A paper describes a structure:
In the Siphoviridae SPP1 phage, the tail tube consists of the TTPs gp17.1 and gp17.1* in a ratio of 3:1, with the latter being generated by a translational frameshift adding a fibronectin type III (FN3) domain to the C-terminus of the protein. However, virions only containing gp17.1 are still viable and infectious, indicating that the additional C-terminal FN3 domain is dispensable for phage assembly and infection. gp17.1 monomers are unstable in solution and spontaneously self-polymerize into long tubes in vitro which are indistinguishable from native tubes. Six gp17.1 subunits assemble into a ring with the inner 24 β-strands forming a β-barrel that defines the inner lumen of the tube. The α-helices are arranged almost parallel to the tail tube axis. These rings stack onto each other with a rotation of 21.9° forming a right-handed helical, hollow tube.
Residue numbers in the entry:
A (entry chain D), B (entry chain E), C (entry chain F), D (entry chain A), E (entry chain L), F (entry chain B), ...: 5 to 176
The structure:
């Protein structure tokens, strides 16, 4: 079925007006929760509790913050400046009659949480409501991230290419 | 008694008007909860708390979402378009004076939950109320699924039948 | 003292009008809870919080449902048709000046819960209120169940008595 | 200090009018909880939250019920008939200027709970309020129980004294 | 006392409905383990840890698999088709008031293990639980195996009776 | 830093009028909780939620009760007679410009809890509010307890000094 | 990304008027929680739940208290005298176009918690609200602490430099 | 019975789409382990622990890796590229109504282990789970390996056929 | 250094009140284990894992039980009656400024183990905790045992001194 | 196949930025362990336990430490300074379309172990995790070590070339 | 490489304030174990399991205790009084640009173990944690022990120099 790595979530800010949506690395986990409100109280009749109602749609996003990357800075301007961000969640498996497959919306920063612990690494919990996320097919592959997600491995670096802790440095 | 695999749940959408009910693969677990409201307050009399009342009937359904299958797309049109779905829960053990045995109702999408984690695979929690599920015998076997639930095993494929990750491919 | 297997619970339906109470196999566990309401608020006086009040008596019953047996079908007509059932809880140890020893009442189906999981077997949680359970001695032994509860073991079946998964089959 | 076996609790019923208090075997554990209500709201003054108030005194008692013993039947008439019971909690260690040491009160049966499980043995949770338990020295040793609590061991029974599951039978 | 060769174990399948139980050659060793669950926790009382409880009865069977013989094919349909098998363990020494002496039950295939090594020969470890094995006297001698277990030795074959690796061939 | 054994808590009763504060042995653990109430509701202004307010100061004390010792009897007269007790919490590490270092207050017995279990030993949970605990330096060392806390070990007792379970008896 | 040791938190008191902010050793963990309040109730319209609102910003700080150090004494005057403290949280990794990187605010002592246990060492939980923490770059390195955080190790001390439990003593 | 050399294991990759399954030389040993999950907890009833359940089927494979051969390169693409491999285990003894006899499945690379020691030769431990291995008859003899397994011996090479360490070289 | 025979262990019971400590013959071996609990979790600071803590001190004693000797009967009253015993472990080599050298404590009988085997002789494993064993110099030589430990050899007995299996009998 | 001496492991440090990877002499043995995480729980479906997952890749390295050589000093700066090291494992047998054949990665020092014993020589156990080792062909022969591994033997030294314990000294 | 006798371990106590570190004779063996904690959970990303973490550094020391020598008495005051000891481990082979080569730290007595057996001689197992051992060059040779470790042999003593069991006595 769909794998845990398969569904990934990208956001595009409204004010940027750019042709691309930053997504942030080191994801922890993603809960999108969607409540469809229903009829109150049957009155012991013919079923007055199976009726239509409004939908309350909210999601939370947890990840580990990196020192300085752009979806996080998008989140930072999102919460700290106070803007809504465009919300995209797509699947990495290629769509057979589209680029990718997505669910889309406009979202807000309901709350943000920052944990610093003595073990592990900094963890951000960001919670958001949305006014109705809709499903569609994803057009922008953005093959740097969704298409290409590598383990950092590269074939050799044996003459010494000025390397460091990162998974491939070059000489100067 | 009845096994955990024995009771399986199929839904048929109202708008489809088809002669068959899609059920979805990769089930996690099924809670159907049925509350029969009773008399308030004995008044220290002869028993004024054992009296009849209305019934609140609600169930939740958890499963792992597959990339694109029809009960899930039935769920997707169920929640996202906003429709009630016909609710069938039957037992795989053959009925001796019926095809199968069932409990049936008309149900609504009270809430849906979608979890994406770094481990495991995508998990959907869908919660629904119903206006009174009733018990009957199941007429439609649908022997593709209830009758036939295989492990994917097949006897050999040894001359090379263009195989893949799926449990039986054929040449082209 | 009294063992976990020692206290067993039988129900007799009101409408049946039969000389025997069906009890259901594969019990999980039984909670009977009895609240005796007391005086409110001493007023820092001589003890105005040790005073008499009404009693709220409710119990829940958990068990694993078998495909088709009669106490369960008694439960099924109990909840699904909407009837109160006569409530008997007796002890398997023989009473020395009675057949058995019991607590008795008339009970209602406040709620029923049905769990289907991928592991294990179907589990029913049924919750009920009662209007005052009373203690007495149990007259009906019903020696098929209370008196006789066997492990299914039988001495031999060695010439082949057309056996199956059940603990004793006979030839045809 | 005081051991877990050291503090034991006996009750004497009001209506019995006997010169002895039944305590029940197979104790699980005993919580006596005593709340001394205090002044509301300092008003940021000189301390208007350290002031005297009434006391709410309640305790719960858990034990494993034996088939038929008298403190349990005292509990049974306590709850089921609806009476208050005199409450004694004493220490097994001998008092140096009294028989024993006790805390005493008059208590009521606020609630009773009966659990039957498939494992283990029947367990009773009984909850009670009291109108002020007071501390004193215990006069009645009742040396059958507090003074004498044996493991059931006896030196030999080797010529055969018609024995059973109990820790000492005699011939007929 | 009873020898290592003395106690041998035969199984009869439920579905066969035959008048005889296949046992398999080349036994390695047989562990039958039977746990009688007891009372929890004395509470430092009169002995609340010597009390009765349920019994967990499980056994494992190790043997060396032969290319094609019927108890193994009984095991193979046992595990691979998924059936319970009737369980017989009898003693080779003749019973003085019965044919043989046995312990009997109905058993299931909890697990099977197959080892192929470069040394030695294929070894099967099969583990099973049972719902209560009972002791009785064995009625069916089956004198081909229990009564008769020969070393393969035969007096002569000197004119040439078309012999092979097996312990007695005949001419064609 | 400060160790778990380092901070110890002594109480002095108001009515005693003695030159010394009893502290009780066999401490379990000490929670002192101090809430400083703040401004409600910024009104999205310049910060109307960072404003000063009153302080709610409460602590709970858990320990294992000894048969008869004086801080416990101080607690007993504290709760059961109904008095406030003077509250001292000091550190065992010697102060360099004082005897010891302390936090001090006047405290009340908001609630007391007594647990008797079948395992372990009697445990008292006592909860108290205070009208503002203040920090100071501790003047009274009380070197019997804070200064001197021994394991009970003594060099020898080899000619027999009429010993018992306690860590040093003498002859008569 | 950012490590658990990487983000550290310093406070500067308002009244001190000094050119440096004390931070306290032996940190346990730091939760900063920031709630951005949003529009109530869509009314099933065009999205009236994605709207702007106020922000509730609160954090809690846990650490192990040392006998006498200045951020703790800053905390002590913070809570016990009743002052707001200036709030700085910076990252240890050097900023490439600033000294360091920080988030800054003015904060208050909403609550303080002090735990003394028999195991481990004294633990302080301090909770605070803030009226809007803002992100900036950190100017003051304070290289004693952020820049320099050593394990206490030093190369040798072999002629005897009057040493103690601390990680480097000198002769007198 | 079946010998240690008798049962040999071949794998065929899914993506290859070839009419033949590579098996790897220098086998160490093969464990195939198959767990058939059973009913939990009898409840001291009629046997609620002899019931059907799912099957967990896993095997491990140990061998000594050769410099470059195709089943190992099949294993290498299996683990390192991340593919499932078709799993065949057949017996070398000729089947009397089939080519050979087999057990078959689709298998995955759960783990791989590579040991390099100073003694002996490189040893690979590869562990795999399977979703249900089934038994059948083996159709492909592959007489190069199963049918023909020689010691490397050849009758003579006495005029000098440009020989080396391998068991038969030819001139150039 | 210190030999295996050099360190020997004597116990003195508390209740005896005698001027001498029985030690038991036929020692097997003695483990005294002493755990000094330390600081949890550095927090990657300056070393918060090198800190002081409590000490858990426990030892086990193995020996071969003799039919009736007094340290064993001291052990027997120790465990079976339930008393703590005074614990002495001294060295046989003479102290140069004391009689002997010792480590001393008060000890309890945490567990006792008795093995009877078909080979060898009865073996007792007794395990004990202690509340802090301290080191000192041993005052009581007890020269019968520590000072004098002979092989049982005596110069002659040649006129016949009514001898037996023991290493020196006398006439009657 | 591949010999125990055939596969050897070289590391190159990231910070060095040199055109060569130090490997360390006196290898003991090398375990590289690679776990490919799989799907949880079939749910008794079509095989939901044969699914893809992440890979946990870790290895341990044991060797005997030499007084001062550069891979060990690379290890020493690796662990003691705290750096990741580039990980190369190649085979000594010449590749036919490459220099050598390798598996490569970036690795970290998860743990180091140093044993000093009275027998034998110092032994270092170093354990490391890796984020995905990949297989390739080895480009750098480094013919000093991999290509050339001599026993220390040299043809003669008979006029006296100022020799010592080492396998070839020269005059001064 | 480095021999088993080559690396020896000396300790210097903090409180002594002396210009020399006692090491203890009759070493058994020395394990120093150093764990460098790493990143949790890659999240199937670019390698989030190769990240930096804290280091847990602990060692154990086994030796045979001598009747009275100073490192042992240093150990004895170490554990029994409760002090940390300065930790030095150096190599006996002369450093070419230092006196010797060392690894150094401050260490604590986590646990001590004392075994007395009937065979052999007293054996002490002492276990310790450390807050980060660092490597350096050893300055103090202490040529009595490291430089000079003799077998006890001396050329002659033939006129009788009042000798004993020790390897050289003199006349009186």
């Amino acid at each position: 079925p769909i794998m845990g790595q398969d569904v990934k979530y990208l956001f595009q800010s409204i004010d940027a007006a750019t042709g691309s949506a930053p997504l942030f690395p080191a994801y922890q986990t993603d809960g999108s929760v969607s409540g469809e409100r229903e009829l109150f109280d049957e009155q012991t009749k013919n079923g007055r509790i199976l009726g239509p109602g409004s939908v309350a749609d909210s999601g939370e996003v947890t990840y580990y913050g990196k020192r300085g990357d752009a979806g996080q800075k998008a989140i930072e301007d999102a919460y700290q400046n106070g803007k809504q961000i465009k919300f995209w969640r797509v699947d990495t498996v290629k769509n057979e009659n589209d680029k990718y497959d997505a669910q889309f919306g406009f979202a807000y920063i309901e709350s943000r949480e920052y944990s610093d612990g003595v073990e592990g690494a900094v963890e951000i919990s960001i919670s958001l409501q949305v006014i109705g996320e809709l499903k569609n097919g994803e057009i922008d592959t953005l093959p740097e991230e969704i298409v290409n997600v590598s383990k950092g491995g590269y074939d050799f670096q044996q003459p010494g290419q000025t390397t460091g802790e990162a998974p491939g440095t070059v000489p100067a």
